[PDB]
Amino acid sequence: STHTLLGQFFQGWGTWVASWPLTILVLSVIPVVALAAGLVFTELTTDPVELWSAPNSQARSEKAFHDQHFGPFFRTNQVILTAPNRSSYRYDSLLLGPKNFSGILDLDLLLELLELQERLRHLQVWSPEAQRNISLQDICYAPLNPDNTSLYDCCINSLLQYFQNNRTLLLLTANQTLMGQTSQVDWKDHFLYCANAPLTFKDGTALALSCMADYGAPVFPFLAIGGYKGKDYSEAEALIMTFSLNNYPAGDPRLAQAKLWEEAFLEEMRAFQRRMAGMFQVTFMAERSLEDEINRTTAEDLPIFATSYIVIFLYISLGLGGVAVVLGAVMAAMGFFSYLGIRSSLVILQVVPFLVLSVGADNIFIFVLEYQRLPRRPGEPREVHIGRALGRVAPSMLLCSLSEAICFFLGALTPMPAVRTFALTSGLAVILDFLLQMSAFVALLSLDSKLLLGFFQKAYAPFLLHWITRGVVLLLFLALFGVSLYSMCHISVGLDQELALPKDSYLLDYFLFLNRYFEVGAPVYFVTTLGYNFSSEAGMNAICSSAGCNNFSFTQKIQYATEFPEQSYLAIPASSWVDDFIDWLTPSSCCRLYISGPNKDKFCPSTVNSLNCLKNCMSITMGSVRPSVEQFHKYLPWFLNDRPNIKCPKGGLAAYSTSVNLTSDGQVLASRFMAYHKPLKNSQDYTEALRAARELAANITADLRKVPGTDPAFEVFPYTITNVFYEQYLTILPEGLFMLSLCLVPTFAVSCLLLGLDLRSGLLNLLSIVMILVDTVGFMALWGISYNAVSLINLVSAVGMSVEFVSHITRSFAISTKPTWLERAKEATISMGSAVFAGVAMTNLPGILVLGLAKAQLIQIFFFRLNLLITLLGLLHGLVFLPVILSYVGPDVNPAL
């Protein structure tokens, strides 16, 4: 008899608390201030976007490997222009004939872009470190000269670097004759040539200009122009400007002083946008922007949510004290984790009370209603009266605040750190609410000494409980179940990137141009783990692509997967370094040795010419030349220090200077192979591209481990900058369904174990909760709400919350001792359904009056838009179905003396 013992215990507890209310109130209000001091002490928040990745997941372990061996990924800042007013026209270029250009490639706009680019290059900002005024050379990603980066060696990708940013070279007209000349060649004839082959040093036109940038590296067309899918390289609808800044770990001061340059870059481009509006639509984005704009919306709406926990006060209209009790409990639970050490963000800190308070106030309302509705046996004071009232309401009030702490704690197994912190914070707020609304609230309820609901509940009852009503409500809700369980399959898993922003930020314009005008997605690298030999003649051929090497190979596998971009999510070949290194070892003035030079007997660089150096590295021509082992360690570092000029453009440190990590002897440890994704638009494309690249990587490693000298536990994994975000969605269906399905067991095993309910009433309770979950999943899929990590903690919270909808109804039916089932549930409805309705409306009205006007996309889609569905879909299953279903398959009469 576990139910009877709890009532006796809580009745004696309530009588003693009524006896000593002042002392219990002071001694239970004093241990809240100590826990609340943890908030004011530090409460360290987590600003950046590394609160959305599992700290030991495989996708972040690969990032920790790559970041260690090759340095971190470069931060990118972009500007897109896309002039829409001008008209496409015609140009009869002498080489390729007719070409019908677009309006953005007119010469009147390129100069105006150049005067913005060369002024963004010379930008200086004052830092918190007051000594040094920061230039761009300190924090720029220079792939050719990192030792002392001059200001002209920083990576500034744009179309203007086909002319090396030279104004006079851009304004150049040259006579050229093929005997049918009829014109002079202008800059566009040179741009059309450089688009086809970016590696050329001497242009094939009459005017000669290299297609290489100011820093000695080629610039590809997809990094410069976009929106050119048909009619290639002629009808670009948008220019592109890109600045690359090298990234550091979070503790380094250079990252602190490189986020201050991007702020001035944004504040200068925002002035550039309004300086000209009749000829451009410039949209920009810095890497600082996204992680410091989703915090702005959350930090600009705390006063607009302060009406939430004051509109909690007005709906009860002894009530101020209860809301103060729940707010103190939630604040203490919020501040307790600072002592243990948990870096929670302000976004987590803003929505915790507005989901715990909606469950913490209903128990107060139920207790005060049962205290003010009791028969009030005379001959005894209130000191036993409140204990007598609390004895038969304590266990039912204990189920609904213990079947939510269990649900929230069980829901804290999600991979995301911030969702885990939100679950852990609200899992202890409610459990520190139930312990503090009897040790403090009962003292106030004894210390206070010094309608119409039951009107129309008895008219709402004849609307139900009749065969007109009891035979249509059942099949209608079963049809709702039948439509929801087949609409569940249309649900879409994945969280879009644009839902973190408001409806008015410039990043929405940037993403709308990025999804529509780019032609290559983010780059990806096929990293090679430690172990591969890379030296044997039978070792290079498995990673080769040309001149005698094998039929199928790694850099041949990537190129073959490029040709079906719809299935494999790649759009550019691999560009391996062994393929370029074998080309560089070909003779004729690339790799040469001094013969009679005692002082420089090893290397003759390409730029030096004389009659001294004449011997080649590779000895004699032969079919499919490949170096020996001893010729590898000599000749590989030299290839990583030969800048490409026009005497040997075969390769060098232009693109491979940080793609191989040499040891202290000459055995390579790891490598990278850079290939570009196809244009990825929504969040169902990122995860699918991740899976379709990872399976290709596993195919490559399974093919590559067959060589003789290799080592097992050697895998070639893919890595891109956003792999650490969308890696969870491969495995959120099995780990999401399992967490929900295991979450019903501790509620079913306790709701039928606390208050009667042997099998049938608890079974109907489980049927109601499963119906609520399937209906809310179907309506969530039908609205457009996604199914991600942040939209699963809400469903777990609804599973915890629905015990409110059902437990009091099944309680009042079980205690009912009236004769027939046709009217036995009427007393239970009139007794408890009104109180449950008031409790549900207690979350319904403040659940809509604040979170529906949040102005953030995250709160407006995942907390107002979804909690409203659960709240007004649990009313229909708790006030229209459950009493009706209990009148047909309801248990027989319990005496229950």
Ligand X SMILES: *[C@@H]1O[C@H](CO)[C@@H](O[C@@H]2O[C@H](CO)[C@@H](O)[C@H](O[C@@H]3O[C@H](CO)[C@@H](O)[C@H](O)[C@H]3NC(C)=O)[C@H]2NC(C)=O)[C@H](O)[C@H]1NC(C)=O
Ligand Y SMILES: *[C@@H]1O[C@H](CO)[C@@H](O[C@@H]2O[C@H](CO)[C@@H](O[C@@H]3O[C@H](CO)[C@@H](O)[C@H](O)[C@H]3NC(C)=O)[C@H](O)[C@H]2NC(C)=O)[C@H](O)[C@H]1NC(C)=O
Ligand Z SMILES: *[C@@H]1O[C@H](CO)[C@@H](O)[C@H](O[C@@H]2O[C@H](CO)[C@@H](O)[C@H](O)[C@H]2NC(C)=O)[C@H]1NC(C)=O
Q: Taking CB under 6 A as the criterion, which residues in 780-799 touch ligand H56?
A: 790
Pick one of 200, 533, 661, 860: the residue that binds ligand Y (CB under 6 A).
661
Q: Taking CB under 6 A as the criterion, which residues in 567-586 touch ligand H56?
A: none
**Quick one: 176 or 550, whose CB is closer to ligand Z?**
176
Q: How far is the CB of 527 from ligand Y (least distance, A)?
A: 12
Q: How far is the CB of 431 from ligand X (least distance, A)?
A: 56
Phi-psi map region of 78: left, alpha, beta (phi>0 left; psi -120 to 50 alpha): beta
**Quick one: 131 or 148, whose CB is closer to ligand NAG?**
148
Q: Taking CB under 6 A as the criterion, which residues in 312-351 touch ligand H56?
A: 345, 347-348, 351
Pick one of 1, 131, 148, 596: the residue that binds ligand NAG (CB under 6 A).
148
Interface segment toward ligand CLR; rule CB under 6 A; list 39-47, 242-250, 741-749, 828-836: 39-47
Q: How far is the CB of 731 from ligand CLR (least distance, A)?
A: 23
**DSSP secondary structure string, 63-94?**
HHHHHHHH-PPPEEEEEE----SS----EEET
* 69 forms part of the interface with ligand Y (CB under 6 A): yes
* 175 forms part of the interface with ligand Z (CB under 6 A): yes
Q: How far is the CB of 661 from ligand Y (least distance, A)?
A: 4
Interface map 634-673 toward ligand X (x if CB under 6 A): ---------------------------------x------
Token pair recorded at residue 786? 């996604």
* 419 forms part of the interface with ligand H56 (CB under 6 A): yes
**DSSP secondary structure string, 142-209?**
-SS--SS--GGGS-EESGGGGTTT-HHHHS--EE--SSS--SEE-HHHHHHHHHH-TT-SS-SSSS--
Size of the site for ligand Y (CB under 6 A): 7
Token pair recorded at residue 886? 């209990």
Q: Taking CB under 6 A as the criterion, which residues in 53-92 touch ligand NAG?
A: 84-85, 88, 90
Size of the site for ligand H56 (CB under 6 A): 19
How many angstroms separate the CA atoms of 256 and 258, rounded? 6
- Of 427, 627, 429, 616, whose CA–CA distance to 537 is shortest? 627
- Of 608, 606, 550, whose CA–CA distance to 578 is shortest? 550
509 binding partner (options ligand NAG, ligand Y, ligand X, none; Cβ < 5 to 8 Å by kind): none
| 830 DSSP assignment | I
Whole-angstrom CA distances from 110 to 188, 279, 486, 874 are 12, 12, 56, 61
* 71 forms part of the interface with ligand Y (CB under 6 A): yes
In sign, the C-alpha dihedral spanning 829, 831, 837, 843 is negative
**Quick one: 18 or 618, whose CB is closer to ligand X?**
618
85 binding partner (options ligand Z, ligand X, ligand NAG, none; Cβ < 5 to 8 Å by kind): ligand NAG
**Quick one: 47 or 703, whose CB is closer to ligand NAG?**
703
- Residue of closest CB approach to ligand X: 133
Q: Which amino acid is at 624?
A: S
Are 347 and 295 a contacting pair, CB within 8 Å?
A: yes
Q: Taking CB under 6 A as the criterion, which residues in 552-611 touch ligand Y?
A: none
Beta strand 75-80 pairing with 238-245: antiparallel
888 binding partner (options ligand Z, ligand CLR, ligand X, none; Cβ < 5 to 8 Å by kind): none
* 184 forms part of the interface with ligand Z (CB under 6 A): yes
Are 101 and 91 a contacting pair, CB within 8 Å?
A: yes
Interior angle at CA 650, CA 523 and CA 535, nearest 5 = 80
Q: Taking CB under 6 A as the criterion, which residues in 161-180 touch ligand Y?
A: 166, 168-169
Q: Taking CB under 6 A as the criterion, which residues in 217-276 touch ligand X?
A: none
Taking the mean position of all CA atoms in its chain, how far away is CA 176?
A: 55
| Distance between first and last Cα of the chain | 13
* 206 forms part of the interface with ligand Z (CB under 6 A): no
Pick one of 169, 692, 782, 838: the residue that binds ligand CLR (CB under 6 A).
782
**Quick one: 504 or 665, whose CB is closer to ligand Y?**
665
Q: Which residue has the tokens 């609307």?
A: 463
* 640 forms part of the interface with ligand Y (CB under 6 A): no
**Quick one: 303 or 598, whose CB is closer to ligand CLR?**
303
Beta strand 668-671 pairing with 660-662: antiparallel
- Of 850, 747, 848, whose CA–CA distance to 804 is shortest? 747
Residue 499 exposure: Cα atoms within 13 Å on the Cβ side:
16
Q: Taking CB under 6 A as the criterion, which residues in 432-491 touch ligand CLR?
A: 435-436, 439
* 533 forms part of the interface with ligand X (CB under 6 A): yes
* 100 forms part of the interface with ligand NAG (CB under 6 A): yes
Rounded to 5 degrees, what are φ and ψ at 652? 160, -140
Interior angle at CA 477, CA 476 and CA 478, nearest 5 = 90
List residues binding ligand H56 (CB under 6 A). 49, 51-52, 294, 345, 347-348, 351, 418-419, 422, 495, 497, 499-500, 725, 790, 857-858
Chain residues binding ligand Y by CB under 6 A are 68-69, 71, 166, 168-169, 661
Residues near ligand Z, by CB under 6 A? 175, 184
